[PDB]
Design a protein around this motif. Structure first.
Motif, PDB file in Angstrom:
ATOM      1  N   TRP B 102       0.825  -1.200   0.000  1.00 28.59           N
ATOM      2  CA  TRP B 102       0.000   0.000   0.000  1.00 28.59           C
ATOM      3  C   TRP B 102       0.861   1.252   0.000  1.00 28.59           C
ATOM      4  O   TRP B 102       0.599   2.197  -0.752  1.00 28.59           O
ATOM      5  CB  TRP B 102      -0.924  -0.002   1.212  1.00 28.59           C
ATOM      6  N   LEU B 103       1.892   1.279   0.842  1.00 29.24           N
ATOM      7  CA  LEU B 103       2.760   2.447   0.896  1.00 29.24           C
ATOM      8  C   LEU B 103       3.381   2.721  -0.463  1.00 29.24           C
ATOM      9  O   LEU B 103       3.314   3.845  -0.975  1.00 29.24           O
ATOM     10  CB  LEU B 103       3.845   2.242   1.946  1.00 29.24           C
ATOM     11  N   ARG B 108       3.340   5.870  -5.393  1.00 30.99           N
ATOM     12  CA  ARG B 108       3.452   5.936  -6.845  1.00 30.99           C
ATOM     13  C   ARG B 108       2.388   6.834  -7.456  1.00 30.99           C
ATOM     14  O   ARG B 108       2.630   7.435  -8.507  1.00 30.99           O
ATOM     15  CB  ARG B 108       3.380   4.542  -7.455  1.00 30.99           C
ATOM     16  N   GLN B 109       1.211   6.946  -6.844  1.00 29.23           N
ATOM     17  CA  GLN B 109       0.243   7.893  -7.396  1.00 29.23           C
ATOM     18  C   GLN B 109       0.211   9.237  -6.674  1.00 29.23           C
ATOM     19  O   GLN B 109      -0.819   9.915  -6.718  1.00 29.23           O
ATOM     20  CB  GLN B 109      -1.180   7.326  -7.432  1.00 29.23           C
ATOM     21  N   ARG B 110       1.298   9.652  -6.030  1.00 28.57           N
ATOM     22  CA  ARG B 110       1.350  11.003  -5.491  1.00 28.57           C
ATOM     23  C   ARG B 110       1.680  11.996  -6.604  1.00 28.57           C
ATOM     24  O   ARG B 110       1.767  11.646  -7.782  1.00 28.57           O
ATOM     25  CB  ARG B 110       2.367  11.099  -4.361  1.00 28.57           C
ATOM     26  N   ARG B 111       1.863  13.260  -6.226  1.00 30.86           N
ATOM     27  CA  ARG B 111       2.097  14.343  -7.180  1.00 30.86           C
ATOM     28  C   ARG B 111       3.283  15.197  -6.758  1.00 30.86           C
ATOM     29  O   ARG B 111       3.215  16.426  -6.736  1.00 30.86           O
ATOM     30  CB  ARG B 111       0.865  15.227  -7.333  1.00 30.86           C
ATOM     31  N   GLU B 112       4.398  14.559  -6.410  1.00 31.82           N
ATOM     32  CA  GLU B 112       5.562  15.279  -5.909  1.00 31.82           C
ATOM     33  C   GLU B 112       6.723  15.276  -6.894  1.00 31.82           C
ATOM     34  O   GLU B 112       7.873  15.458  -6.486  1.00 31.82           O
ATOM     35  CB  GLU B 112       6.008  14.705  -4.567  1.00 31.82           C
ATOM     36  N   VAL B 116      11.254   9.710  -5.142  1.00 32.06           N
ATOM     37  CA  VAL B 116      11.853   9.842  -3.817  1.00 32.06           C
ATOM     38  C   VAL B 116      11.039  10.808  -2.963  1.00 32.06           C
ATOM     39  O   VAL B 116      10.721  10.525  -1.801  1.00 32.06           O
ATOM     40  CB  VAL B 116      13.323  10.279  -3.931  1.00 32.06           C
ATOM     41  N   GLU B 117      10.663  11.952  -3.536  1.00 38.84           N
ATOM     42  CA  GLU B 117       9.850  12.914  -2.804  1.00 38.84           C
ATOM     43  C   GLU B 117       8.475  12.348  -2.484  1.00 38.84           C
ATOM     44  O   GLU B 117       7.967  12.533  -1.372  1.00 38.84           O
ATOM     45  CB  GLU B 117       9.718  14.203  -3.609  1.00 38.84           C
ATOM     46  N   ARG B 118       7.856  11.663  -3.446  1.00 38.70           N
ATOM     47  CA  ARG B 118       6.545  11.074  -3.202  1.00 38.70           C
ATOM     48  C   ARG B 118       6.610  10.059  -2.074  1.00 38.70           C
ATOM     49  O   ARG B 118       5.764  10.056  -1.174  1.00 38.70           O
ATOM     50  CB  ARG B 118       6.019  10.416  -4.474  1.00 38.70           C
TER      51      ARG B 118
END
Lengths: 65, 153, 115, 126, 31
Positions: B102-103, B108-112, B116-118
């Motif tokens: 899950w993590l 993987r679907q963040r917006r950073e 690495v930042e996501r």
RNA sequence: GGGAGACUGGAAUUCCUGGUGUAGCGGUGGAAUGCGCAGAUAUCAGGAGGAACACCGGUGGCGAAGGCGGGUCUCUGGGCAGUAACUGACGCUGAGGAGCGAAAGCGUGGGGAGCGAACAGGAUUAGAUACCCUGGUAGUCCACGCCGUAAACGGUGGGUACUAGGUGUGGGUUUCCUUCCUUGGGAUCCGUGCCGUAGCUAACGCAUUAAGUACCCCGCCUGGGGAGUACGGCCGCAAGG
């Protein structure tokens, strides 16, 4: 197996008046016990069942307490 | 798995952190066998987390894992010719696996703008209890509870 | 009111379970049903729904002053033991257990068999 | 329902008859049909008593249904193929009405493979 | 014995009974 | 529990009335029609009515077969055993004929709780004149009569004599272990099951309760459909036989 206590030379007569003699032949639910558990002969089993029904009919035995 | 359980792979402890969990994490983020890139991503995310919070990264990673680790899950069961969603208890290993998967996915679907930042942001919010993985654990627990009537079989 | 000792009647059918705490004279002071605790359809025949209904009824009896109860279970076994256990677990002292299920002496005809 | 027919050699009008007959089977299928193919072939040897061979394949929502028949001409082969396909679709149904008699019933009466096993206490009944 | 024979006899009987039912008033009026 | 009549008991279902009491109940694989909020379901008390008789209760009893068990009383049929007192072949079968004959159905008059063809909705389905659900009329019940059929089957007509055994169980007489309590055991007569010889059978199987070995009398069969149908006749209110 077991003994027909009524076919013996001391076999007490089966009546609908003597309540205890019948109470020993019905289960704790007031149902009539089976022949194989009781062990008496067929004629005495019929006599016992008829006596139990007659006693119930005159409110001497509960109708399944 | 018809003839019995299969042995598990004993993956090694990480050299620069000495924890089983980080190696599990790098193997979860691994793609196409590029292990070096996966290790770079995980190490960079851990260092970003350490910089942001100011403490050890493994402790906050463990805190995030405990925050997103599930305990009750739902599996479809066919008993007597009928299928229902039955809540089932989760073994510790499957809970760790689910939490890590899950993590990694929800990072993987963040917006950073960079993985690495996501990953760092996701692990930080999971530590503080605001991640989308935390949310996902909330819905899985909710679904397990809402089907409790079927737990008797 | 204040009824310290009362009776609990549990009716467990094949698709529901109804609990009604009753004043020993036969008056009902608090009742909970399987569909009263948020279940509907086939969901309310489950033992968990029986547990929930029993707990709800026990609480609704408890603020009425009911401290000790005796149960009268009835119906085909679905959640009877679960209902009694939930009655006990909700802070109610259960005195005696009695199974009173209406047993006909071969009267009235049952409906035709399903296929 | 759209059907594609891949005949060979000489079979005039077989394609149209086969298409029109097979396309009528869509309503019988209880799930949407994803594809349908029919092939008509004829045996070169005059000694063969039933030369024409018809085959069909339907993708009934992922379930493959196929049949094959032989006949003396195109029309008979197509009609027999339609009969066979209808029988197969009847046996494939798998909705509730088709599996309501196989679901285990009763409580202790009758036993089946998927019947619910009886619950047993730890101690022997006695 | 196979039930096939019973099936043939029962279908004949059923058809005859249906025919009798369909022409009851006609038979009554002609007889 | 063989049959007929009369009287009568309790449990349960339904309904009605009155309390308590609230918001669901009911139903299914899953639901919806449906009931309830005008007070339902649940619980308690009281009342009315009809039908069927839990346990005893079984591969156990009785009856020619259909079939027959709540209790009591009245009337009545058959069977079995023992003694063998009596009669002295009075026996067996039986064409036609007469009687009885489940259920459904029919007529007249009552009754009608539950169940329930038909019929209504709901659902499932491609379609449901069905299966499932909610209702529900004839009918089921009683009196008196019709009908005269059933997988009315042990698919095995009746009577008689003979042909290894073993083991259950029902009814009755008797000798010996003998406590004589005890299925003690034996012998015997009459039933009712299972297993098994010889023998029989195409085989399966039957096998002292024969489908074995024989004798007497009756019914029936003569390839499958057409057809247990048409025609004619008899019976029936009709269905129809």
């Amino acid at each position: 197996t077991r003994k027909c206590v009524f076919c013996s030379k001391k076999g007490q007569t089966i009546d609908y008046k003597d309540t205890a003699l019948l109470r020993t032949y019905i289960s704790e639910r007031g149902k009539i016990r089976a022949r194989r558990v009781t062990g008496n002969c067929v004629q005495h089993q019929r006599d016992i069942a008829v006596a139990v029904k007659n006693a119930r009919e005159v409110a001497l035995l509960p109708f399944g307490s | 798995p018809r003839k019995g359980p299969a042995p598990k792979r004993p993956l090694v402890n990480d050299p620069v952190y000495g924890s089983q969990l980080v190696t599990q994490l790098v193997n979860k983020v691994l793609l196409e066998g590029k292990k070096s890139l996966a290790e770079r991503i995980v190490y960079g995310a851990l260092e970003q987390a350490r910089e942001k919070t100011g403490t050890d990264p493994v402790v906050t990673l463990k805190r995030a894992l405990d925050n997103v680790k599930p305990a009750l899950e739902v599996r479809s069961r066919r008993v007597g010719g009928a299928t229902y969603q039955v809540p089932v208890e989760v073994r510790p290993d499957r809970s760790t696996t689910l939490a890590l998967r899950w993590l990694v996915n929800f990072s993987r679907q963040r917006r950073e703008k960079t993985m690495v930042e996501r990953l760092a942001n996701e692990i930080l919010d999971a530590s503080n209890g605001l991640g989308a993985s935390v949310k996902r654990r909330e819905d899985t627990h909710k679904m397990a509870e809402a089907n409790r009537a079927f737990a008797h079989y | 009111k204040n009824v310290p000792h009362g009776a609990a009647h549990i009716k467990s059918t094949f698709n529901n379970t109804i609990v009604s705490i009753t004043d020993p004279q036969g008056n009902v002071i608090a009742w909970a049903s399987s569909g009263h605790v948020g279940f509907k359809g086939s969901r309310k025949s489950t033992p968990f729904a029986a547990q929930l209904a029993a707990e709800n009824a026990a609480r609704k009896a408890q603020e009425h002053g009911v401290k000790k109860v005796d149960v009268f279970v009835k119906g085909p076994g679905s959640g009877r033991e679960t209902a009694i256990r939930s009655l006990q677990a909700a802070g109610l002292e259960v005195g005696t257990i009695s199974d009173v299920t209406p047993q006909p002496h071969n009267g009235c005809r049952p409906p035709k068999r399903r296929r | 329902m759209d059907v594609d027919v891949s005949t060979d050699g000489e079979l005039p009008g077989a394609a149209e008859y086969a298409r029109e007959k097979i396309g009528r089977l869509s309503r019988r299928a209880h799930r949407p049909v994803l594809h349908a193919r029919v092939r008509l072939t004829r045996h070169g040897d005059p000694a063969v008593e039933r030369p024409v061979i018809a085959q069909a394949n339907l993708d009934v929502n992922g379930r493959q249904v196929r049949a094959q028949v032989e006949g003396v001409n195109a029309r008979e082969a197509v009609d027999r193929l339609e009969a066979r396909l209808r029988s197969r679709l009847e046996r494939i149904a798998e909705h509730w009405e088709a599996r309501r008699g196989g679901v285990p019933a009763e409580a202790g009466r009758e036993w089946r493979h998927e019947s619910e096993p009886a619950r047993r206490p730890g101690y022997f009944p006695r | 014995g196979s039930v096939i024979k019973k099936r043939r006899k029962r279908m004949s009987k059923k058809k005859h009974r249906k025919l009798l039912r369909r022409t009851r008033v006609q038979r009554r009026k002609l007889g």
